[PDB]
Each structure stands twice: as structure tokens, then as C-alpha cells.
Amino acid sequence: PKHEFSVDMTCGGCAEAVSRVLNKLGGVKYDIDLPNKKVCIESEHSMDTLLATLKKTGKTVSYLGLE
Amino acid sequence: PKHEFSVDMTCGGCAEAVSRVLNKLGGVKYDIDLPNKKVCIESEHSMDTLLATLKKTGKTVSYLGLE
Ligand SMILES: [Pt+2]
Ligand SMILES: [Pt+2]
């Protein structure tokens, strides 16, 4: 399943932070689009799990849907 | 007790993310200095709680000491 999220990232360090939390989660294939504030994730993890992992950064997060 | 941390923040959004995870922890009084990449926290929470809360954000954190 391929999930897409809005993540409020403003600088490269913001993007690195998201990468670090996703790395620590494991079991994910992710793609981070900094200028458009999007994080695309392919994973067997539930959307709830991905959402909670992203919210751990303290950044504003929302769901852009599947596929 | 005032704990002091180095936190690799490189934009205002980075600073706000740190404030959010601290707010959610609760029981903290803090000051975030962006240009100097320093967070100062007054709290009864253990430094282990504080550190883990900061590290949860995906940013590079290290501990500077007390005051
Ligand atoms: Pt995508
Ligand atoms: Pt940032």
C-alpha cells in the first residue's frame, strides 16, 4: 500500500528529521518532497502507525490518501 | 532545575516542532534559541524523559548540563 502525507517541512533539516523518524520505524519505503511538503510511504504498516510516527516530529501532519 | 540541550534546528519550523513535543509532554517551562541551536528546559521530569522527548523529533540532540 502506498500512502501519501502532508508534512509541514520548511528546511532541509526538517526533511532529515522525517527521514530519521521513518528510519527508526523501519519496514518502510519512503519518498520526501520538501518543496511540496509531501511524504510518500509504501509500507505494510497501518496508516495509523505511519501517521503517529510522522506526528512524532512535532510537525503538522495530515493524510493525502492512498494509491 | 534548568536542563540545557543542543538541538540541531535550522529554521523556525524546526523550533516550533520542538515546542510542540514539549507542550505534549507537559510540566515544562522552556526557552528555544534558534540561532544558537539551544533549548533550555525547567522541569521536574528526568533528563532521560526530556532527552527522549527531544530525540523523538528526529533532530540531532545532545545534553549540555545544568544550571
Ligand atoms: Pt506518492
Ligand atoms: Pt526546519
Side-chain angles (χ1 to χ4, degrees), chain A residues 8-29:
Chain A
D8 183 29
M9 304 166 287
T10 38
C11 74
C14 286
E16 293 180 3
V18 170
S19 165
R20 278 192 205 97
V21 308
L22 291 184
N23 285 347
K24 189 183 172 188
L25 170 62
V28 290
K29 197 178 310 168

PDB file of all heavy atoms in Angstrom, chain A residues 8-29:
ATOM      1  N   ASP A   8       4.499  19.377   7.300  1.00  0.00           N
ATOM      2  CA  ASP A   8       4.898  20.772   7.247  1.00  0.00           C
ATOM      3  C   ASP A   8       6.420  20.907   7.457  1.00  0.00           C
ATOM      4  O   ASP A   8       6.891  21.121   8.576  1.00  0.00           O
ATOM      5  CB  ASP A   8       4.105  21.543   8.314  1.00  0.00           C
ATOM      6  CG  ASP A   8       4.387  23.028   8.305  1.00  0.00           C
ATOM      7  OD1 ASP A   8       4.723  23.570   7.233  1.00  0.00           O
ATOM      8  OD2 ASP A   8       4.266  23.654   9.383  1.00  0.00           O
ATOM      9  N   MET A   9       7.184  20.746   6.379  1.00  0.00           N
ATOM     10  CA  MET A   9       8.644  20.847   6.438  1.00  0.00           C
ATOM     11  C   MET A   9       9.065  22.139   5.754  1.00  0.00           C
ATOM     12  O   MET A   9       8.571  22.451   4.672  1.00  0.00           O
ATOM     13  CB  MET A   9       9.301  19.670   5.706  1.00  0.00           C
ATOM     14  CG  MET A   9       8.890  18.288   6.175  1.00  0.00           C
ATOM     15  SD  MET A   9       9.387  16.999   4.998  1.00  0.00           S
ATOM     16  CE  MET A   9       8.225  17.268   3.667  1.00  0.00           C
ATOM     17  N   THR A  10       9.980  22.885   6.360  1.00  0.00           N
ATOM     18  CA  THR A  10      10.389  24.158   5.768  1.00  0.00           C
ATOM     19  C   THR A  10      11.855  24.209   5.297  1.00  0.00           C
ATOM     20  O   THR A  10      12.171  24.893   4.322  1.00  0.00           O
ATOM     21  CB  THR A  10       9.991  25.374   6.654  1.00  0.00           C
ATOM     22  OG1 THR A  10      10.170  25.046   8.032  1.00  0.00           O
ATOM     23  CG2 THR A  10       8.536  25.696   6.456  1.00  0.00           C
ATOM     24  N   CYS A  11      12.733  23.466   5.956  1.00  0.00           N
ATOM     25  CA  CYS A  11      14.141  23.437   5.569  1.00  0.00           C
ATOM     26  C   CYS A  11      14.617  22.005   5.393  1.00  0.00           C
ATOM     27  O   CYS A  11      13.894  21.061   5.695  1.00  0.00           O
ATOM     28  CB  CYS A  11      15.003  24.148   6.610  1.00  0.00           C
ATOM     29  SG  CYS A  11      15.247  23.242   8.153  1.00  0.00           S
ATOM     30  N   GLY A  12      15.839  21.846   4.902  1.00  0.00           N
ATOM     31  CA  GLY A  12      16.416  20.523   4.721  1.00  0.00           C
ATOM     32  C   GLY A  12      16.531  19.738   6.019  1.00  0.00           C
ATOM     33  O   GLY A  12      16.383  18.522   6.023  1.00  0.00           O
ATOM     34  N   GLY A  13      16.802  20.430   7.121  1.00  0.00           N
ATOM     35  CA  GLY A  13      16.845  19.777   8.423  1.00  0.00           C
ATOM     36  C   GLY A  13      15.498  19.175   8.812  1.00  0.00           C
ATOM     37  O   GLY A  13      15.437  18.117   9.464  1.00  0.00           O
ATOM     38  N   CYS A  14      14.419  19.856   8.423  1.00  0.00           N
ATOM     39  CA  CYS A  14      13.066  19.339   8.617  1.00  0.00           C
ATOM     40  C   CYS A  14      12.927  17.991   7.900  1.00  0.00           C
ATOM     41  O   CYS A  14      12.440  17.016   8.465  1.00  0.00           O
ATOM     42  CB  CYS A  14      12.021  20.329   8.080  1.00  0.00           C
ATOM     43  SG  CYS A  14      11.723  21.835   9.067  1.00  0.00           S
ATOM     44  N   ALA A  15      13.360  17.952   6.645  1.00  0.00           N
ATOM     45  CA  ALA A  15      13.319  16.726   5.847  1.00  0.00           C
ATOM     46  C   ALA A  15      14.174  15.613   6.439  1.00  0.00           C
ATOM     47  O   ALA A  15      13.793  14.435   6.379  1.00  0.00           O
ATOM     48  CB  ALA A  15      13.746  17.008   4.423  1.00  0.00           C
ATOM     49  N   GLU A  16      15.334  15.981   6.993  1.00  0.00           N
ATOM     50  CA  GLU A  16      16.228  14.993   7.585  1.00  0.00           C
ATOM     51  C   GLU A  16      15.565  14.362   8.790  1.00  0.00           C
ATOM     52  O   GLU A  16      15.708  13.159   9.026  1.00  0.00           O
ATOM     53  CB  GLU A  16      17.545  15.631   8.016  1.00  0.00           C
ATOM     54  CG  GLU A  16      18.403  16.122   6.870  1.00  0.00           C
ATOM     55  CD  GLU A  16      19.702  16.749   7.351  1.00  0.00           C
ATOM     56  OE1 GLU A  16      19.954  16.736   8.574  1.00  0.00           O
ATOM     57  OE2 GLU A  16      20.466  17.262   6.509  1.00  0.00           O
ATOM     58  N   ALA A  17      14.835  15.188   9.545  1.00  0.00           N
ATOM     59  CA  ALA A  17      14.164  14.754  10.763  1.00  0.00           C
ATOM     60  C   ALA A  17      13.129  13.690  10.451  1.00  0.00           C
ATOM     61  O   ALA A  17      13.058  12.664  11.127  1.00  0.00           O
ATOM     62  CB  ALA A  17      13.499  15.948  11.472  1.00  0.00           C
ATOM     63  N   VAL A  18      12.318  13.955   9.430  1.00  0.00           N
ATOM     64  CA  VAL A  18      11.328  12.996   8.964  1.00  0.00           C
ATOM     65  C   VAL A  18      12.020  11.714   8.531  1.00  0.00           C
ATOM     66  O   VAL A  18      11.564  10.617   8.857  1.00  0.00           O
ATOM     67  CB  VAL A  18      10.516  13.544   7.772  1.00  0.00           C
ATOM     68  CG1 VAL A  18       9.675  12.449   7.167  1.00  0.00           C
ATOM     69  CG2 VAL A  18       9.642  14.721   8.205  1.00  0.00           C
ATOM     70  N   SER A  19      13.131  11.845   7.806  1.00  0.00           N
ATOM     71  CA  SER A  19      13.874  10.653   7.394  1.00  0.00           C
ATOM     72  C   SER A  19      14.325   9.831   8.602  1.00  0.00           C
ATOM     73  O   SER A  19      14.196   8.613   8.601  1.00  0.00           O
ATOM     74  CB  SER A  19      15.079  11.011   6.530  1.00  0.00           C
ATOM     75  OG  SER A  19      15.955   9.899   6.451  1.00  0.00           O
ATOM     76  N   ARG A  20      14.833  10.505   9.632  1.00  0.00           N
ATOM     77  CA  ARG A  20      15.313   9.821  10.829  1.00  0.00           C
ATOM     78  C   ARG A  20      14.212   9.084  11.582  1.00  0.00           C
ATOM     79  O   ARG A  20      14.440   7.968  12.033  1.00  0.00           O
ATOM     80  CB  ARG A  20      16.044  10.779  11.778  1.00  0.00           C
ATOM     81  CG  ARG A  20      17.495  11.027  11.396  1.00  0.00           C
ATOM     82  CD  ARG A  20      18.258  11.738  12.512  1.00  0.00           C
ATOM     83  NE  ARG A  20      19.404  12.486  11.996  1.00  0.00           N
ATOM     84  CZ  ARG A  20      19.401  13.793  11.733  1.00  0.00           C
ATOM     85  NH1 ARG A  20      18.311  14.531  11.952  1.00  0.00           N
ATOM     86  NH2 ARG A  20      20.498  14.370  11.251  1.00  0.00           N
ATOM     87  N   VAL A  21      13.030   9.692  11.725  1.00  0.00           N
ATOM     88  CA  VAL A  21      11.945   9.004  12.430  1.00  0.00           C
ATOM     89  C   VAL A  21      11.425   7.817  11.629  1.00  0.00           C
ATOM     90  O   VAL A  21      11.090   6.783  12.202  1.00  0.00           O
ATOM     91  CB  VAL A  21      10.794   9.938  12.892  1.00  0.00           C
ATOM     92  CG1 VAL A  21      11.353  11.095  13.683  1.00  0.00           C
ATOM     93  CG2 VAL A  21       9.982  10.458  11.711  1.00  0.00           C
ATOM     94  N   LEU A  22      11.391   7.955  10.306  1.00  0.00           N
ATOM     95  CA  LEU A  22      10.962   6.861   9.448  1.00  0.00           C
ATOM     96  C   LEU A  22      11.994   5.735   9.418  1.00  0.00           C
ATOM     97  O   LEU A  22      11.638   4.562   9.387  1.00  0.00           O
ATOM     98  CB  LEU A  22      10.690   7.362   8.028  1.00  0.00           C
ATOM     99  CG  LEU A  22       9.469   8.259   7.866  1.00  0.00           C
ATOM    100  CD1 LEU A  22       9.246   8.614   6.394  1.00  0.00           C
ATOM    101  CD2 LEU A  22       8.235   7.602   8.481  1.00  0.00           C
ATOM    102  N   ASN A  23      13.271   6.090   9.407  1.00  0.00           N
ATOM    103  CA  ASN A  23      14.322   5.079   9.507  1.00  0.00           C
ATOM    104  C   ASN A  23      14.179   4.267  10.788  1.00  0.00           C
ATOM    105  O   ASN A  23      14.293   3.048  10.777  1.00  0.00           O
ATOM    106  CB  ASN A  23      15.707   5.724   9.471  1.00  0.00           C
ATOM    107  CG  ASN A  23      16.107   6.177   8.075  1.00  0.00           C
ATOM    108  OD1 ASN A  23      15.481   5.804   7.087  1.00  0.00           O
ATOM    109  ND2 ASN A  23      17.164   6.973   7.990  1.00  0.00           N
ATOM    110  N   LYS A  24      13.918   4.951  11.894  1.00  0.00           N
ATOM    111  CA  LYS A  24      13.814   4.277  13.174  1.00  0.00           C
ATOM    112  C   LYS A  24      12.595   3.358  13.204  1.00  0.00           C
ATOM    113  O   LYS A  24      12.613   2.322  13.856  1.00  0.00           O
ATOM    114  CB  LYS A  24      13.787   5.285  14.320  1.00  0.00           C
ATOM    115  CG  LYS A  24      13.903   4.651  15.701  1.00  0.00           C
ATOM    116  CD  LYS A  24      13.792   5.701  16.805  1.00  0.00           C
ATOM    117  CE  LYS A  24      13.719   5.056  18.190  1.00  0.00           C
ATOM    118  NZ  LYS A  24      13.415   6.046  19.269  1.00  0.00           N
ATOM    119  N   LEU A  25      11.542   3.728  12.484  1.00  0.00           N
ATOM    120  CA  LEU A  25      10.341   2.898  12.435  1.00  0.00           C
ATOM    121  C   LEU A  25      10.626   1.590  11.716  1.00  0.00           C
ATOM    122  O   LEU A  25      10.263   0.515  12.194  1.00  0.00           O
ATOM    123  CB  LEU A  25       9.187   3.621  11.734  1.00  0.00           C
ATOM    124  CG  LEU A  25       7.970   2.737  11.428  1.00  0.00           C
ATOM    125  CD1 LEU A  25       7.336   2.181  12.714  1.00  0.00           C
ATOM    126  CD2 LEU A  25       6.935   3.484  10.593  1.00  0.00           C
ATOM    127  N   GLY A  26      11.270   1.690  10.559  1.00  0.00           N
ATOM    128  CA  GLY A  26      11.602   0.520   9.772  1.00  0.00           C
ATOM    129  C   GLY A  26      10.402  -0.032   9.035  1.00  0.00           C
ATOM    130  O   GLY A  26       9.261   0.321   9.331  1.00  0.00           O
ATOM    131  N   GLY A  27      10.665  -0.899   8.062  1.00  0.00           N
ATOM    132  CA  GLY A  27       9.618  -1.525   7.279  1.00  0.00           C
ATOM    133  C   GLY A  27       8.900  -0.554   6.366  1.00  0.00           C
ATOM    134  O   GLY A  27       7.718  -0.741   6.062  1.00  0.00           O
ATOM    135  N   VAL A  28       9.612   0.485   5.923  1.00  0.00           N
ATOM    136  CA  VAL A  28       9.016   1.489   5.040  1.00  0.00           C
ATOM    137  C   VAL A  28       9.869   1.846   3.830  1.00  0.00           C
ATOM    138  O   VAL A  28      11.092   1.855   3.889  1.00  0.00           O
ATOM    139  CB  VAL A  28       8.731   2.795   5.791  1.00  0.00           C
ATOM    140  CG1 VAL A  28       7.583   2.601   6.777  1.00  0.00           C
ATOM    141  CG2 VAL A  28       9.988   3.270   6.502  1.00  0.00           C
ATOM    142  N   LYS A  29       9.201   2.161   2.732  1.00  0.00           N
ATOM    143  CA  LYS A  29       9.859   2.690   1.550  1.00  0.00           C
ATOM    144  C   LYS A  29       9.283   4.089   1.353  1.00  0.00           C
ATOM    145  O   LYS A  29       8.093   4.239   1.066  1.00  0.00           O
ATOM    146  CB  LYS A  29       9.545   1.804   0.350  1.00  0.00           C
ATOM    147  CG  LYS A  29      10.461   1.971  -0.840  1.00  0.00           C
ATOM    148  CD  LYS A  29      10.056   0.995  -1.943  1.00  0.00           C
ATOM    149  CE  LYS A  29       9.904  -0.424  -1.395  1.00  0.00           C
ATOM    150  NZ  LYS A  29       9.239  -1.347  -2.362  1.00  0.00           N
TER     151      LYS A  29
END
